[PDB]
Design a protein around this ligand. Sequence first.
Ligand code: NAP
Ligand code: NAP
Ligand code: 4SI
Ligand code: 4SI
Lengths: 157, 156
Amino acid sequence: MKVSLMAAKAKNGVIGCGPHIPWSAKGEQLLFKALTYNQWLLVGRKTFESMGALPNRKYAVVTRSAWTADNDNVIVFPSIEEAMYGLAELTDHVIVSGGGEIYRETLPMASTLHISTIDIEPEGDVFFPNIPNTFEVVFEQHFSSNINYCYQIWQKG
Amino acid sequence: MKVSLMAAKAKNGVIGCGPHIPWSAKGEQLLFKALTYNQWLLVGRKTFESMGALPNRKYAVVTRSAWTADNDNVIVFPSIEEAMYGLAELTDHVIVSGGGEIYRETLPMASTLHISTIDIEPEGDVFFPNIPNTFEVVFEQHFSSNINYCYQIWQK
Ligand SMILES: NC(=O)c1ccc[n+]([C@@H]2O[C@H](COP(=O)([O-])OP(=O)(O)OC[C@H]3O[C@@H](n4cnc5c(N)ncnc54)[C@H](OP(=O)(O)O)[C@@H]3O)[C@@H](O)[C@H]2O)c1
Ligand SMILES: NC(=O)c1ccc[n+]([C@@H]2O[C@H](COP(=O)([O-])OP(=O)(O)OC[C@H]3O[C@@H](n4cnc5c(N)ncnc54)[C@H](OP(=O)(O)O)[C@@H]3O)[C@@H](O)[C@H]2O)c1
Ligand SMILES: CCc1nc(N)nc(N)c1C#C[C@H](C)c1cc(-c2ccc(C(N)=O)cc2)ccc1Cl
Ligand SMILES: CCc1nc(N)nc(N)c1C#C[C@H](C)c1cc(-c2ccc(C(N)=O)cc2)ccc1Cl
């Protein structure tokens, strides 16, 4: 099973401010919707609660508590290793879609990264990890918008 | 100026049947939307008439006749050479978005290709060109849908 990771980060590394993503970049949500369409997503419990079970995707959520989802489109796991093992029975591909914690915990498992960098430097208390040099950019495209953004695909060599 | 090209082709190479794309692969249009957002596109006159002048894009359209367009976001050019030369003054990047004829005439100038292959072999009279071996795939992702599709990005 292949693990991808999709994230949007501000120029200063911020990805979150409390339970909110602290920018609104017109156009960027299209990439996220387009690349995740009918995909399996792996998210942390907090991210899942902020985003919800959006239509046309399937969800693996991890929690350390007895927390549960209300939805036969979501599988809840007690660990990332269990989620990975369970997902590999259902699909050959999962896209890690966030939580700062989940990103830190799964970045060494990822073999391709979908990284949108937003031309803004907001306040926030949740950050994206530094991208290790195990990965290289293989595609990049710039977008002008109300807030500009740059989409890069990174591959593990 | 950078030239990209983006297309959806069936597994038998068909991209069109008359004025129509001969399939509906639910979700694939999202890729096209995402990659063309606030971009300049280059299209042939027939493809432009088949498509809306959809929002948040600017359209260079080529024709050999007297055809013209109302929409403020469209510039009409008499040839590909003139479109390319005039686009270079207007933008840093154009995405060639089709016409079989337009794809044939512009594939040699593209440096990256966005290619969605649709899990179908329909009837049609317009085909995508042979991709030269100067291009290689740098990214690939499969999608399951009513008709499955595979998204590949090629770099020259
Ligand atoms: N810009 C972006 O790309 C993007 C994307 C997504 C989210 N965000 C932002 O990121 C922030 C949320 O990130 P976060 O780090 O606070 O939370 P998170 O990663 O979304 O979720 C953390 C929770 O997941 C569970 N968890 C984490 N690791 C686990 C493990 N190894 N085993 C079992 N359960 C595990 C725990 O759930 P329990 O507490 O239930 O035990 C933990 O509290 C928000 O601000 C959101 O807006 C940004
Ligand atoms: N699946 C996909 O990725 C996709 C994408 C787009 C379109 N399509 C399909 O492709 C089909 C249309 O393709 P097509 O090849 O018939 O038409 P097209 O390439 O879209 O347009 C051809 C027209 O463009 C103009 N043109 C072409 N070369 C020119 C040049 N060098 N200088 C000036 N004008 C030039 C001419 O317009 P005039 O006739 O006005 O002189 C020509 O008739 C449709 O079926 C459509 O559904 C598929
Ligand atoms: C578009 C942001 C983004 N970009 C890239 N590149 N990668 C990413 N991971 C994310 C993300 C995210 C989290 C998961 C999220 C998403 C949503 C949400 C809800 C509805 C829509 C929609 N427009 O329908 C879009 C997004 C809400 C809360 C959160 Cl927390
Ligand atoms: C989306 C298919 C596609 N995929 C990839 N990968 N590359 C491409 N070039 C195209 C294309 C195309 C032509 C230009 C086209 C587009 C549209 C159209 C229809 C609906 C919407 C929408 N859903 O709002 C947006 C665009 C209609 C007719 C045509 Cl003839």
